[PDB]
Design a binder for this molecule. Structure first.
Ligand SMILES: CN(C)CCCCC(=O)Nc1ccc(NC(=S)NC(=O)c2ccc(C(C)(C)C)cc2)cc1
Ligand SMILES: Cc1cc2nc3c(=O)[nH]c(=O)nc-3n(C[C@H](O)[C@H](O)[C@H](O)COP(=O)(O)O)c2cc1C
Ligand SMILES: CCCCCCCCCC[N+](C)(C)[O-]
Ligand SMILES: O=C1C[C@@H](C(=O)O)NC(=O)N1
Ligand SMILES: [Cl-]
Length: 363
């Protein structure tokens, strides 16, 4: 009924009438004022997950990039997400790339973007989160945690120092931080996934995190690309275990263009998201789980539009999942749809809950 309206009428009219950047801004705005259904799906106990030092009422989060500046957090919980990740936030404000910088590939259920870390900056986000800090503390306690994704400024001379500043400023306000070393849209950034660079960077990040007062001390995750070599994945796994990194977000967008893309805009520069990324992301989860012996929580992201999509990532090793791109095509009903289908599939496959399914394919 209501998922059939947004998918076939509203989203085709929103997206047909406005350029994707405009549409996204309007969506942030609407979401932030809480103009959504109100959201009817009541989360089953089957969907609760305990990971990263927190309870998650359900395992479906909004991926980084939808709410870059932390403006819509409460509306995103109201949409039925189990957890919200904001960002990426850069130390200083910066504008990002010139427009157009986001492209829909409706025939692929995909998006390409080259935003380039358009960010209001740490200070503005810090103030926005402080204004609701206690409210968030109650949400977290009730099983609705908040992640903050950190990036780096385009002209920064010292990448590690940018991330460290991010830890110092937003770490105290976050349940988890993400060291986003996987945007395809900032020159040299993905180099920070290499072994020696990554170890030096994360050492410094963890030190900064460790220097925060205990109730303000977040988990630290690293978000990785789907385009890594085997060598690069081996090396990340090694560093993450050596340093005690709390988890991985797997994956960012791809700079690949899988054969079969039909959208006219398929050769635009940027990162590809949505359904052509799905199985590349799933396979990256699968390998990172195996290389970390199932001991390092993974948040699985890339092309999730359904309960099956979510369960494939969980079974491959994700403790939690996120989605973004599906919202472009299905709108807010997709969240309840993913949850309901995931619950039914867990029951069908004989799992007592999401926790029992995590990594099941490896057992
Ligand atoms: C007639 N109306 C519009 C009001 C009707 C009821 C409320 C409502 O529609 N709310 C609402 C809330 C959110 C949305 N859309 C969402 S959540 N997302 C997007 O439209 C969107 C997401 C991502 C992108 C890019 C940047 C990836 C392309 C673009 C749009 C649409 C409608
Ligand atoms: C328009 C857009 C902007 C994004 N911005 C960011 C960001 O700032 N930081 C980040 O770590 N990931 C960013 N992502 C990546 C998503 O968080 C996600 O990793 C990727 O889009 C795969 O999930 P999806 O297929 O469900 O969209 C962005 C994605 C899109 C589509
Ligand atoms: C709020 C003061 C800082 C503004 C700096 C410019 C950041 C551009 C972010 C882009 N946009 C507003 C479209 O999301
Ligand atoms: O991490 C990121 C950053 C983003 C951008 O261009 O800002 N685009 C992405 O696809 N991933
Ligand atoms: Cl082409």
């Amino acid at each position: 009924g209501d998922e059939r309206f947004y998918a076939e009428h509203l989203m085709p009219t929103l997206q047909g009438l406005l350029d994707p950047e405009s549409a996204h801004r309007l969506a942030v705005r609407f979401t932030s004022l809480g103009l959504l259904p109100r959201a009817r799906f009541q989360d089953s106990d089957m969907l609760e997950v305990r990971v990263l030092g927190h309870k998650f009422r359900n395992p479906v989060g909004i991926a980084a990039g939808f709410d870059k500046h932390g403006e819509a957090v409460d509306g995103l919980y109201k949409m039925g997400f189990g957890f919200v990740e904001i960002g990426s936030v850069t130390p200083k404000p910066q504008e990002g790339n010139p427009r157009p910088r986001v492209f829909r590939l409706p025939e692929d259920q995909a998006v390409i973007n080259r935003y380039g870390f358009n960010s209001h900056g740490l200070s503005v986000v810090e103030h926005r989160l402080r204004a609701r800090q206690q409210k968030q503390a109650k949400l977290t306690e009730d099983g609705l945690p908040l992640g903050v994704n950190l990036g780096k400024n385009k002209t920064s001379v010292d990448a590690a120092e940018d991330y460290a500043e991010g830890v110092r400023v937003l770490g105290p306000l976050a349940d988890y931080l993400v060291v986003n070393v996987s945007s395809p849209n900032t020159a040299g950034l993905r180099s920070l996934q290499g072994k020696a660079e990554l170890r030096r960077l994360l050492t410094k990040v963890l030190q900064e995190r460790d220097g925060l007062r205990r109730v303000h001390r977040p988990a630290v995750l690293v978000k990785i690309a789907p385009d890594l070599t085997s060598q690069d994945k081996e090396d990340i796994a090694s560093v993450v275990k050596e340093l005690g990194i709390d988890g991985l977000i797997v994956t960012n967008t791809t700079v690949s263009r899988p054969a079969g893309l039909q959208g006219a805009l398929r050769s635009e520069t940027g990162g590809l998201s949505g359904k052509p990324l799905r199985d590349l992301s799933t396979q990256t989860i699968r390998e990172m789980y195996a290389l970390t012996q199932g001991r390092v929580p993974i948040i699985g992201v890339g092309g999730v539009s359904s309960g099956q999509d979510a369960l494939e990532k969980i079974r491959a090793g994700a403790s939690l999942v996120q989605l973004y791109t599906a919202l472009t095509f299905w709108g807010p009903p997709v969240v309840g749809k993913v949850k309901r289908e995931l619950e039914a599939l867990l029951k069908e496959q004989g799992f007592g809950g999401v926790t029992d399914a995590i990594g099941a394919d490896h057992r």
